[PDB]
Structure 1
């Protein structure tokens, strides 16, 4: 069902797309994985240490 939902949108079903480096501007081979992840900022700051 993840594959089906992905294909509902026009995204590549494999889950991995092809990026481009920022500095050089040339392509990464080996298509990489990109998505959306939920992240939290834990209560261990640097300025309290």
Structure 2
């Protein structure tokens, strides 16, 4: 219960609250209002950004459709969504839409 934790904090000699006075490092001036400090044990999930960069400029094309491969398995590249085409139509940027579909 909370009371047992408060007794443990008293044994530690800390005040009966999580928040404590802190001082900003750059100016060394204490912030108005005490700030709670906890261990907050944390873990790192298996989602590294090293493999997610997926930078591609020129890649091999699908034999049947002559189109770029996807998923980053070889050179990857980002597929253009149909909904994105609707947003381009709303913008009225026909030159961007026409160039992306044919030359790209």
TM-score, reference length from structure 1: 0.89
Equivalences, count? 49
Q: Which has the larger radius of gyration?
A: 2
Q: What TM-score, normalized by structure 2, do the two folds share? A: 0.45
Aligned to 2:61: none
1:23 and 2:26 correspond: yes
Higher helix share: 2
Alignment deviations for residues 9-43 of structure 1 (CA, whole Å, 9 cap, x no partner): 11111121000001011110111111111100110
Shift of 1:48: 1.5
The structure where strand makes up a greater share of residues is 1
Runs of 4+ residues deviating >2 angstroms: none
| C-alpha RMSD of matched pairs (Å) | 0.8
Select the structure with the greater relative contact order (CA < 8 A; seq sep ≥ 6). 1
| Structure 2 Cα separation of the partners of residues 30 and 9 of structure 1 | 22
